[PDB]
């Protein structure tokens, strides 16, 4: 029963092993969980719309809230979870969602009311609402407006612009903030201590620095570093270099070579060095980000050069965000910034 769950969690990757089960495990998204904890004692949970960067804990927050609300018994009877792996057209929204909303709430047991608040409404959550078409979204308007007495709607998305304006107005907007080093160092250190991850002083803070506001990627990198340090068995501590090696970060010397080729060099030398660099597998997004950090941070370039480098890096990132060829985009970016 519970022991099987404990063992399955212990044999699970750290992303799912340390998933927040209660509203207190949320480390940084405090403004939302404060309201969620206050409404736990009341019974006026409004329709909610979670939006923010990926890996901020929206799904974990709503799961912990539904748990703390309904208990592990009513967790499976008063919840309608619809993900992006299911059909969510107009037909589905009109039939299934509306039939579940029109239905009455299931009767709680005697053990439920003694430990959990058991609100008189159920919860219908729609994860990854970006893939929902606007007509199927507008179909949900009156469905969530008239049956609010018996069901509550929780939308979850990454881009709040993909959801129509009426739905965004009907739901309370909860913006999840990026999890940088400051507001996630406590959670990362807790995960490291619970797994006996022996690292150096500036490793964890560096990991989140590579994560760029993503605790899931940081936990995955920490798990990979711990596995790589346990395989060696040397008993030493994990270093920031070993972490940034497996995180896809280009070494500093290779980036300085690119800066030298951009500063001094013609089209042919730059093209040859780019062709050689693309042989070693590096993500073009990470290279663009590192070049942006170096160029904007270095206090040795003119402001007129800085405006142009910022606009060029922005254009290159916008082009790379569409599935383009990394080699062509990187070569074009380096050539354009070399003419400056």
């Amino acid at each position: 029963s519970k022991l099987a769950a404990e063992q399955s969690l212990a044999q699970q990757p750290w992303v799912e092993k340390y998933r927040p089960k209660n509203l207190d495990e949320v480390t940084a998204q405090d403004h939302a969980v404060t309201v969620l904890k206050k409404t736990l004692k009341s019974a006026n949970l409004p329709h909610m719309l979670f939006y923010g960067p990926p890996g901020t804990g929206k799904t974990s927050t709503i799961l912990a809230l539904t748990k703390e609300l309904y208990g592990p018994d009513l967790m499976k009877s008063r919840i309608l979870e619809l993900n992006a792996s299911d059909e969510r057209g107009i037909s589905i929204v009109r039939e299934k969602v509306k039939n579940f909303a029109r239905l009455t709430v299931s009767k709680p047991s005697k053990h439920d009311l003694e430990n959990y608040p058991c609100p008189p409404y159920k919860i219908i959550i729609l994860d990854e609402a970006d893939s929902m078409t606007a007509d199927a979204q507008s179909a949900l308007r009156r469905t969530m407006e008239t049956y609010s007495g018996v069901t509550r709607f929780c939308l979850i998305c990454n881009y709040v612009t993909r959801i129509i304006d009426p739905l965004a107005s009907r739901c309370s907007k909860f913006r999840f903030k990026a999890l940088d080093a400051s507001n996630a160092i406590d959670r990362l250190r807790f995960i490291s201590e619970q797994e006996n991850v022996k690292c150096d002083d500036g490793v964890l803070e560096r990991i989140l620095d590579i994560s760029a506001g993503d605790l899931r990627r940081g936990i995955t990198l920490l798990q990979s570093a711990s596995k790589g340090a346990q395989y060696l068995g040397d008993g030493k501590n994990i270093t920031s270099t070993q972490v940034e090696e497996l995180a896809g970060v280009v070494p500093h010397d290779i980036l300085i070579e690119i800066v030298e080729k951009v500063k001094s060099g013609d089209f042919d030398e730059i093209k040859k060095y780019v062709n050689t660099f693309m042989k070693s597998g590096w993500s073009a997004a990470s290279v663009v980000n590192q070049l942006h950090e170096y160029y904007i941070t270095n206090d040795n370039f003119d402001t007129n050069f800085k405006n142009q480098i910022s606009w060029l890096l922005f254009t290159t990132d916008s082009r790379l965000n569409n599935g383009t060829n990394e080699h062509i985009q990187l070569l074009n970016l380096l050539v354009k910034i070399s003419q400056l």
């Binding site: 403004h31 404060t34 309201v35 206050k38 409404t39 019974a43 006026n44 949970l45 409004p46 329709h47 009109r94 609100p119 008189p120 007509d135 507008s138 179909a139 949900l140 308007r141 009156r142 469905t143 407006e145 008239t146 609010s148 007495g149 881009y159 612009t161 304006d165 009426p166 107005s169 009907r170 739901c171 309370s172 907007k173 913006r175 903030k177 990026a178 940088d180 400051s182 507001n183 506001g213 997004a285 663009v288 980000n289 942006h292 904007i296 941070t297 206090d299 402001t303 007129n304 800085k306 405006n307 142009q308 480098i309 910022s310 606009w311 890096l313 922005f314 990132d317 916008s318 965000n321």
Partner: protein
Amino acid sequence: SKENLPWVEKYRPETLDEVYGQNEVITTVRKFVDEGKLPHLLFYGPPGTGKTSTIVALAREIYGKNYSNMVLELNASDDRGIDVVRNQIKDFASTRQIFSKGFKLIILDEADAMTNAAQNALRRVIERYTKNTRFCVLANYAHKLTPALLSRCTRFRFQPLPQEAIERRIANVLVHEKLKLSPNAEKALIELSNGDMRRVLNVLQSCKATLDNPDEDEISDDVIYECCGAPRPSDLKAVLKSILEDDWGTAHYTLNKVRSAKGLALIDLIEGIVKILEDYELQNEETRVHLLTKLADIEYSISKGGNDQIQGSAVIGAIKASFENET
């Protein structure tokens, strides 16, 4: 009980006297109903202006407490096709009431999602059965309605809620709830609403939940800004000043510390800087052209993701290069 509904649903107007903001249309509709000549209505307006509440209170005032039986209310949640029209709407219009004597009311809420064939079939239902029933079409976009259907109804445009009416509703809510609100906090709340009562009610409930107290204290600007995650005018103007005057590295550091100290979003800062720079009396419009173009491009790129630092540096560089033409 009504104490379980959210504040958006709990405070839904039940009478025409509780619908604030709309005065020129509310008085005209009241006169239409009192004098008897109620034509086919077309309530066009943005979300959260009070069209559905207005028509519900109107039907309540017309038919009484039995509104839910003497009125045929169809919406996008219900299947609205051409066959649905042909059967249901025509059978409702051709027949009479089962509870009393009088004209009928068909409320086609959110009728901007109806098929073109459905509207083509309904435009002759509205013109044929016009002595025993009426039609009310609610819309947010007037381009999704055919011109033939658009010409058969009297159009009423629901303007966004002004300051006086939204403050009156806020005072009503603060009377109904054991809650106090600061004047500057109220002004900041009105600023982040754009005439949307739903947003105001939602964030008011959320900041009441944020209070953490038995509500013996007041709600200040800090509570509102920390609960809605919206940037403050102080940090907004500080970032704008550091971008316009200070150095590139210093501007980058200022933007980073501002967006990381309160967890602010880059899109909110972009919109705030756009709103602030709209009052700037500037030179030759080339700077404004470049600024608007680059800011809209960066906003459209943010709407799809990417690197937040790269986009922030892009915003800084765009504003700087746009203002470099003003010299």
